[PDB]
Structure 1
């Protein structure tokens, strides 16, 4: 019937925008009071131009940046359409990522869980397992009393570029033999399990196949280690069982605290038939 005018404070109530976001939009010339009373010299918003806030508010909401808010501003139906197909494209990445992290977190937990719900601790059992993909490298010379955390550098600067996470555990293998002394053993390999390219030759992506495994788990102590190994041996022996794998070792910290003492969780598997 006639044009209606509103003050910045009045537009802030109609639209649900702060009278601060309003000036910001005016200053970067995204939304400007279309009118200016010559007497007061104050600027008034026009009822007509409000419609323009609709786009600005939906875009802000989806976190769209400035220079795309101005770009989309001049797009008519068709273009503006492909504009969103481009937004649903960007939200997806954000979506697949969070959906990715989510798995690598439930995955990290299924493992912490088992550890916690161990049938018996420091005893031997035969449970079936599954294909645990692993990145491996050679533990040349390094043994159960030689390995360093830095021995697993390269292996971890990988699990990260795939999982972003580091490694749940520190793996290592060795031949199943009837050892008598600790210095009788040397690691064949050292590995870290993968949770999900340009892998260098000195490394091998492989796995810990599935089947029956004779495992024993216990919380570390510089002396339960060997004893527990032997007892796995013996168990396998007292059953006349056919071992078809190296011995798999998985150390994993109970906590990552500076205040307290080093505390690890050890588990040793051997695929038996």
Structure 2
């Protein structure tokens, strides 16, 4: 025999008035009585129990329309409904976990590039391996490589990492080049930021790595003159100390910013493994 106005229900069940009017229009939760003259909504006490399901399902993210079918299932079916919710949550969990790990890897590589000792100077450090996915360069060289060239690689990596690669790589035979027009890339590649199985990789792609070891490295902001100059520094560094190269030259490029406004600028790093 006790009835409540929309405001009272709102204060009692901690649900906004607008939400009550909406659930009314949606036919999810309608007032027991509507005054035909004022259109005022009135609710009964026993009815409040229905807001328990609605609030709990809202808390777990169930869409309103699906709530309508939830209040129609039996306690047994509701049990299963929750089982399904757990499955989805475990699915959300590992997605966030993987993402949490990926982000951490990105920051690690990001910091490493911000902590670089100096630009335009050859350094010899002990590197850890870098997992990559590569494909033959098809005759492409430093002057004609395009972002579009990495299209097939990015698709695969995006399908397993989600976080699209930010670094673009290429490799070439270590030679005493006297001109850029003399060099041709062997492979182009993109590092993989995840260990998630890849969805049926075609044979024209190879999963491999930049092996851990001692590397002669040099980093700098790209410019045609810098590219040539720094490559020659690397070559001279190796000849001067008669070092022995045991891998191709690895070239990684990463933009310094992604602003469509500012003049584009890229960071380049060349590495060559030595005995």
Answer whether TM exceeds 0.5 for this pair.
yes
Alpha-carbon distance in structure 2 between the residues aligned to 1:235 and 1:252? 24
In the superposition, relative to structure 1, how do residues 260 and 6 fare at CA in structure 2: closer, same or farther (>3 Å)?
A: closer
Alpha-carbon distance in structure 2 between the residues aligned to 1:40 and 1:150? 65
Match of 1:104 among 96, 102, 105: 102
In the superposition, relative to structure 1, how do residues 126 and 9 fare at CA in structure 2: closer, same or farther (>3 Å)?
A: same
Matched residue, 1:118 = 116
1:211 aligns with 2:213: yes
In the superposition, relative to structure 1, how do residues 151 and 36 fare at CA in structure 2: closer, same or farther (>3 Å)?
A: closer
What's the RMSD between the two structures over aligned residues?
A: 2.4
Give the TM-score, by structure 2 length.
0.88
Q: Displacement of 1:202 after TM fit?
A: 1.8
Q: Structure 2: state its 5+ residue gaps.
A: none
Alpha-carbon distance in structure 2 between the residues aligned to 1:37 and 1:136? 72
Alpha-carbon distance in structure 2 between the residues aligned to 1:5 and 1:272? 84
Q: Displacement of 1:162 after TM fit?
A: 2.0
Q: Displacement of 1:59 after TM fit?
A: 0.8
Give the TM-score, by structure 1 length.
0.89
Deviation track 1:186-211 (CA, whole Å, cap 9, x = no partner) reads 11111111112222222212111111
In the superposition, relative to structure 1, how do residues 250 and 48 fare at CA in structure 2: closer, same or farther (>3 Å)?
A: same
Deviation track 1:27-82 (CA, whole Å, cap 9, x = no partner) reads 33332333578999965322122122111111112221234323332445443333
Alpha-carbon distance in structure 2 between the residues aligned to 1:85 and 1:185? 60
In the superposition, relative to structure 1, how do residues 218 and 31 fare at CA in structure 2: closer, same or farther (>3 Å)?
A: same
Any idea what SS the aligned residue of 1:192 has?
Answer: strand
Any idea what SS the aligned residue of 1:81 has?
Answer: helix
Deviation track 1:15-38 (CA, whole Å, cap 9, x = no partner) reads 111222223323333323335789
Alpha-carbon distance in structure 1 between the residues aligned to 2:158 and 2:269? 23
Runs of 4+ in 1 over 6 A off after TM superposition: 36-42
Match of 1:42 among 40, 43, 52: 40
Alpha-carbon distance in structure 2 between the residues aligned to 1:184 and 1:176? 12
Any idea what SS the aligned residue of 1:245 has?
Answer: strand
Q: Structure 1: state its 5+ residue gaps.
A: none
Matched residue, 1:201 = 203
In the superposition, relative to structure 1, how do residues 88 and 9 fare at CA in structure 2: closer, same or farther (>3 Å)?
A: same
1:189 aligns with 2:191: no
Alpha-carbon distance in structure 1 between the residues aligned to 2:69 and 2:253? 55
Q: How many residues align?
A: 271
Deviation track 1:153-212 (CA, whole Å, cap 9, x = no partner) reads 211222222223322111000111122222221111111111122222222121111111
